[PDB]
UniProtKB/Swiss-Prot annotation, chain A:
This is Large ribosomal subunit protein uL4A. Component of the large ribosomal subunit (LSU). Mature yeast ribosomes consist of a small (40S) and a large (60S) subunit. The 40S small subunit contains 1 molecule of ribosomal RNA (18S rRNA) and 33 different proteins (encoded by 57 genes). The large 60S subunit contains 3 rRNA molecules (25S, 5.8S and 5S rRNA) and 46 different proteins (encoded by 81 genes). uL4 is associated with the polypeptide exit tunnel. uL4 interacts with its chaperone ACL4 and the nuclear import receptor KAP104. Belongs to the universal ribosomal protein uL4 family. It comes from the Eukaryota. It is found in: Cytoplasm; Nucleus. There are 2 genes for uL4 in yeast. It comes from Saccharomyces cerevisiae (strain ATCC 204508 / S288c). Coiled coil: none annotated. Component of the ribosome, a large ribonucleoprotein complex responsible for the synthesis of proteins in the cell. The small ribosomal subunit (SSU) binds messenger RNAs (mRNAs) and translates the encoded message by selecting cognate aminoacyl-transfer RNA (tRNA) molecules. The large subunit (LSU) contains the ribosomal catalytic site termed the peptidyl transferase center (PTC), which catalyzes the formation of peptide bonds, thereby polymerizing the amino acids delivered by tRNAs into a polypeptide chain.
From Swiss-Prot, chain B:
This is Large ribosomal subunit protein uL15. A motif (Nuclear localization signal) lies at residues 6-12, 23-29. Residues 1-13, 20-29 have a biased composition (Basic residues). The gene is RPL28. There is a cross-link at K95 (Glycyl lysine isopeptide (Lys-Gly) (interchain with G-Cter in ubiquitin)).
From Swiss-Prot, chain C:
Component of the large ribosomal subunit (LSU). Mature yeast ribosomes consist of a small (40S) and a large (60S) subunit. The 40S small subunit contains 1 molecule of ribosomal RNA (18S rRNA) and 33 different proteins (encoded by 57 genes). The large 60S subunit contains 3 rRNA molecules (25S, 5.8S and 5S rRNA) and 46 different proteins (encoded by 81 genes). It comes from the Eukaryota. The modification Phosphothreonine is found at T143, T151. The lineage of its organism: Eukaryota, Fungi, Dikarya, Ascomycota, Saccharomycotina. This is Large ribosomal subunit protein eL13A. GO terms for cellular component: cytosol; cytosolic large ribosomal subunit. GO terms for biological process: cytoplasmic translation. It is found in: Cytoplasm. Belongs to the eukaryotic ribosomal protein eL13 family. Component of the ribosome, a large ribonucleoprotein complex responsible for the synthesis of proteins in the cell. The small ribosomal subunit (SSU) binds messenger RNAs (mRNAs) and translates the encoded message by selecting cognate aminoacyl-transfer RNA (tRNA) molecules. The large subunit (LSU) contains the ribosomal catalytic site termed the peptidyl transferase center (PTC), which catalyzes the formation of peptide bonds, thereby polymerizing the amino acids delivered by tRNAs into a polypeptide chain. The keyword Phosphoprotein applies. One of its GO terms (molecular function) is RNA binding.
From Swiss-Prot, chain D:
Keywords: Acetylation, Cytoplasm, Ribonucleoprotein, Ribosomal protein. The keyword Transmembrane helix does not apply. Present with 31600 molecules/cell in log phase SD medium. N-terminally acetylated by acetyltransferase NatA. Belongs to the eukaryotic ribosomal protein eL36 family. GO terms for biological process: cytoplasmic translation. The modification N-acetylthreonine is found at T1. This is Large ribosomal subunit protein eL36A. Component of the ribosome, a large ribonucleoprotein complex responsible for the synthesis of proteins in the cell. The small ribosomal subunit (SSU) binds messenger RNAs (mRNAs) and translates the encoded message by selecting cognate aminoacyl-transfer RNA (tRNA) molecules. The large subunit (LSU) contains the ribosomal catalytic site termed the peptidyl transferase center (PTC), which catalyzes the formation of peptide bonds, thereby polymerizing the amino acids delivered by tRNAs into a polypeptide chain. It comes from Saccharomyces cerevisiae (strain ATCC 204508 / S288c) (Baker's yeast). PROSITE patterns: RIBOSOMAL_L36E. One of its GO terms (cellular component) is cytosolic large ribosomal subunit. One of its GO terms (molecular function) is RNA binding.
RNA sequence: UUGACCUCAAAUCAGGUAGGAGUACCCGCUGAACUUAAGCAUAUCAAUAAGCGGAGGAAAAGAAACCAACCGGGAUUGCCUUAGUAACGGCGAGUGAAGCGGCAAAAGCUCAAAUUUGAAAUCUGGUACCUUCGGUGCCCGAGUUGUAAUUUGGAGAGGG
RNA sequence: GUUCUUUGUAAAGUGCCUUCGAAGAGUCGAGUUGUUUGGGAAUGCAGCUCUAAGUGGGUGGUAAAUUCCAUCUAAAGCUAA
RNA sequence: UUGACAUUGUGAAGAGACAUAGUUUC
């Protein structure tokens, strides 16, 4: 009966996921994270819906 | 989490920060609220005057609900009108057409009088009213309409 | 065991309580099964919905009567008015309640109307065999939502006959408060020889 | 009834257009009936009075309705049944050893 | 019909005709064995309203149980304990004599299921009962939709589980404010109010 | 003399059933003390452990002798809440539910008491056959001290 | 889904008129004892003594008498989730 | 152990009241 799960305020959960999304542009961030994106066109990388 | 806690810091110190003289033993004062009228009276009066003994009358089978009756002060009131609709009614303060506010429908029981609504006429439907709240309401050309 | 300026607590843990601790570890589990059960049933139940047609009903007590909420079933009266008998209405997916009573004509019309609409908007397949496949609406509830009735208009003229409301309440409270006594002064003054 | 339309006071409550429902038979569960009436009468005159029932009527002739009640209220449950039982006794008396 | 008269007659237990009867009969019973088969209902109208039927499958037993308090067993009165618990002699027993009656016959006829039971007579020493029973494997009962519920295994020894009418009585199974402790069935409802309910996302 | 009936027996009588086990969970009975109160007897631990009887895949409960006091609700069960509240309590230590509201699931019913009385219309069993979880014929038997049809309070029955 | 027997001079539903309308007892209830309950002039349970009625009866969380009102229909029974 | 109530019924004489007919109680 130890606590296994944690409650996060739903709003703040979104502040986080939002924040997270926003950093996936910001190429240095991406770069910093592992991820080999030197030799890619641009960031955000967007690609045909045909995918 | 364990790693941030002061017991981690006490490791290697003999007494876990509980003293060599006075130790940490099972229950020195007694357990729970023991001795409240004896060796723990000083803490009880001050911090908790009023604790022991009785006042007032018993009510067997008291069901709250019976007494449900949330209050709304004039103070707000106008908040029970959606904003768009609200400004429309503020300007054109009149008889003939004045907003109807079901405060029972807003889930209030009684209207109290905290302070100043504008001079717009309002039709106020409520179960109860404080003498003043209603006075102030009329003083802007509203009436209170008594419902249930 | 009393110290500092702390609030007095009441943590009832002096029985063998570690013996009756339920941790809903199966919260995810049940939801799924719960979901599967509905899906198995929805299928088994052919094109019928998962629920029955419930009635409108004003809530009990001083506190909730402002609201109107789904009831259990339709009362022999309502069912009758809406043009069918219960024995049948029970087979057409209408809930009937022999217990409930009619005393308010606003609600009775509401319910009868509710029944009318339901009837028109369902279709009852014949007993024969054919079973002309017709796709299930799962809810009857969603389909025929219950709503709060309109009690007034948005704006209207201010009529003030002048009588304080407040005072009417005080007076009203009063009248009841002495209602008895004055019937004793009516009984005691009647026995004036 | 009729409700006053306000939220305190004598006929406290919301005005609403009324209905008065068709009556439930289960509301006449008490009700006599020609059948039971007959049977009970007949059974009565078979088995007759019982010990405490005799004493009750002899009490009635010799000390009145008020002491009959007091005693009967001990015999039976209560003062209300005792009322009922003494009545029932008076009618045994009048109907029989009189008219 | 006759039944309505028997019914009304039985309610006059202190009637010269009924106490003649009661006295003769209570002597007859007391001579026989404490459990014994009954040829028929002595109260064909009572039996009948309690689910009895005069067809092969239905069985009546008459049984005798001692009256009075439960003397608490304990050698020499000795209770070995706090003194609220020192009582021995005014102690009552939570089940009724009717339960004990049903229980002892039901044990005596394990191949039967007990359906119900009614009081017939007492003196100072004994309360006399008649338990009505059903044979769940007699085909007259296995057919007949009205009584073959009794044939299921969930109804084995209903008398031993407080499931007959006397049972449900003392179990306190009724609706209402007066039966809060005991009605979903006391022990189960205690467990409920003494269970700690902890969620994943703690409330 | 013979034939019943009531009630009671017997059989290696024809066919069946019960026991023991398991017992996490379930329905009852019975029933502590350590402990807490800084001592202790009421209280508390606890309507708990130990002991006893009885079930199932769930058990139990269940179609209101309910809740309410409202514009009323409407079988049962459980979750969230009501609420550490109403209340109990050397009113000390401690204890402590329910009604409404949201939700999960939903589902309703059976007798007794009634003259079939122009027809016991009902049923176990044996038997022969058959399309064998059964049916039909026939025969013993049950049953009128009442087996079916009919009706269950929401009603419902008899006449027209 | 198909296919064979038509179960029937069988069964059931509904509207008006009239007369009816059977509804569980050593139980309900009461006193006392004891146990239990948050249940407080007594929450349930049991023992013993008393013991009903039929416009009756139970409940309506402060005892009692009086008058009303509300609300169900006990002392028998089955039932999935 | 002692009392009351229940198991507990049938006569007869004698006391006891409606207040010197016999239902009732020792
Ligand atoms: Mg911590
Ligand atoms: Mg850590
Ligand atoms: Mg560290
Ligand atoms: Mg250091
Ligand atoms: Mg340090
Ligand atoms: Mg260190
Ligand atoms: Mg140091
Ligand atoms: Mg320290
Ligand atoms: Mg040390
Ligand atoms: Mg020191
Ligand atoms: Mg206190
Ligand atoms: Mg404010
Ligand atoms: Mg706890
Ligand atoms: Mg402890
Ligand atoms: Mg688990
Ligand atoms: Mg559903
Ligand atoms: Mg078909
Ligand atoms: Mg036989
Ligand atoms: Mg002991
Ligand atoms: Mg005690
Ligand atoms: Mg409790
Ligand atoms: Mg937390
Ligand atoms: Mg054999
Ligand atoms: Mg066993
Ligand atoms: Mg115990
Ligand atoms: Mg311990
Ligand atoms: Mg101690
Ligand atoms: Mg200590
Ligand atoms: Mg000690
Ligand atoms: Mg206790
Ligand atoms: Mg145990
Ligand atoms: Mg098994
Ligand atoms: Mg099953
Ligand atoms: Mg299941
Ligand atoms: Mg069951
Ligand atoms: Mg019913
Ligand atoms: Mg109602
Ligand atoms: Mg309910
Ligand atoms: Mg406290
Ligand atoms: Mg407790
Ligand atoms: Mg709900
Ligand atoms: Mg069913
Ligand atoms: Mg009944
Ligand atoms: Mg006990
Ligand atoms: Mg008590
Ligand atoms: Mg009263
Ligand atoms: Mg039955
Ligand atoms: Mg059941
Ligand atoms: Mg003596
Ligand atoms: Mg004897």
């Amino acid at each position: 009966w130890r606590k296994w799960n944690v409650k996060v305020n739903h709003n703040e959960k979104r502040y986080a996921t939002a924040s997270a999304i926003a950093a996936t542009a910001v190429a240095s961030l991406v770069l910093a994270r592992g991820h080999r994106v030197e030799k890619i066109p641009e960031i955000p990388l967007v690609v045909s819906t045909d995918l | 989490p364990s790693r941030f806690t002061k017991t981690r810091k006490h490791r290697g110190h003999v007494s876990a920060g509980k003293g060599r003289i006075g130790k940490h033993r099972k229950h020195p004062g007694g357990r729970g609220m023991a001795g409240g009228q004896h060796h723990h009276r000083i803490n009880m009066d001050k911090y908790h005057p009023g604790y022991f003994g009785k006042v007032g009358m018993r009510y067997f089978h008291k069901q709250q609900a019976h007494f449900w009756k949330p209050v709304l002060n004039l103070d707000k009131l106008w908040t029970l009108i959606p904003e768009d609709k609200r400004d429309q009614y503020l300007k054109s303060a009149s008889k003939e057409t004045a907003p109807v506010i079901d405060t029972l429908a807003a889930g209030y029981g009684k209207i109290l009088g905290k302070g100043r609504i504008p001079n717009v006429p309002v039709i106020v439907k409520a179960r109860f009213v404080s003498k003043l709240a209603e006075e102030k309401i009329r003083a802007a050309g509203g009436v209170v309409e008594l419902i249930a | 065991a009393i110290s500092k300026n702390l609030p007095i607590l009441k943590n009832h843990f002096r029985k063998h309580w570690q013996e009756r601790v339920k941790v809903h570890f199966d919260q995810a589990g049940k939801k799924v099964s719960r979901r599967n059960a509905r899906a198995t049933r929805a299928a088994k139940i052919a094109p019928r919905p998962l629920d029955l047609l419930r009635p409108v009903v004003r809530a009990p007590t001083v506190k909730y009567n402002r609201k109107v909420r789904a009831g259990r079933g339709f009362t022999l009266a309502e069912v009758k008015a809406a043009g069918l008998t219960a024995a049948y209405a029970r087979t057409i997916g209408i809930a009937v309640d022999h217990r409930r009573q009619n005393r308010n004509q606003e609600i009775f019309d509401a319910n009868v109307q509710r029944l009318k609409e339901y009837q028109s908007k369902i279709i009852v397949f014949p007993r024969n065999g054919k079973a002309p496949e017709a796709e299930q609406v799962l809810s009857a509830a969603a389909t025929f939502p219950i709503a709060q009735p309109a009690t007034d208009v948005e704006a209207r003229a201010v009529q003030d006959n002048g009588e304080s409301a407040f005072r009417t309440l005080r007076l009203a409270r009063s009248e009841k408060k002495f209602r008895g006594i004055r019937e004793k002064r009516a009984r005691e003054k009647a026995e004036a020889e | 009834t009729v409700k006053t339309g306000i939220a305190i006071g004598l006929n406290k409550g919301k005005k609403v257009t009324s209905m008065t429902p068709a009556p439930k038979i289960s509301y006449k569960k008490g009700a006599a009936s020609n059948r039971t009436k007959f049977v009970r009468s007949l059974v009565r005159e078979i088995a007759g009075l019982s010990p405490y029932e005799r004493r009750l009527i002899d009490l009635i002739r010799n000390s009145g309705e008020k002491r009959a009640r007091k005693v009967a209220k001990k015999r039976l449950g209560s003062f209300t049944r005792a009322k009922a039982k003494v009545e029932e006794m008076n009618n045994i008396i009048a109907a029989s050893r009189r008219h | 019909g006759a039944y309505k008269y028997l019914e009304e007659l039985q309610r006059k237990k202190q009637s010269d005709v009924l106490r003649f009867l009661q006295r003769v009969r209570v002597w007859e019973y007391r001579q026989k064995n404490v459990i014994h088969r009954a040829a028929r209902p002595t109260r064909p109208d009572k039996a009948r309203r309690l689910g009895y039927k005069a067809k092969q499958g239905f069985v009546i037993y008459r049984v005798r149980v001692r009256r009075g308090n439960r003397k608490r067993p304990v050698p020499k009165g000795a209770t070995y304990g706090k003194p609220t618990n020192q009582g021995v002699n005014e102690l009552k027993y939570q089940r009724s004599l009717r339960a004990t009656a049903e229980e002892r016959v039901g044990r005596r006829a394990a191949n039967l299921r007990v359906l119900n039971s009614y009081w017939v007579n007492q003196d100072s020493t004994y309360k006399y009962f008649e338990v009505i029973l059903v044979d769940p494997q007699h085909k007259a009962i296995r057919r007949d939709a009205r009584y073959n519920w009794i044939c299921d295994p969930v109804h084995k020894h209903r008398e031993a589980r407080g499931l007959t009418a006397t049972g449900k009585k003392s179990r306190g199974i009724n609706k209402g404010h007066k039966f809060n402790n005991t009605k979903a069935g006391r022990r189960k409802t205690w467990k409920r109010q003494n269970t700690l309910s902890l969620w994943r996302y703690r409330k």
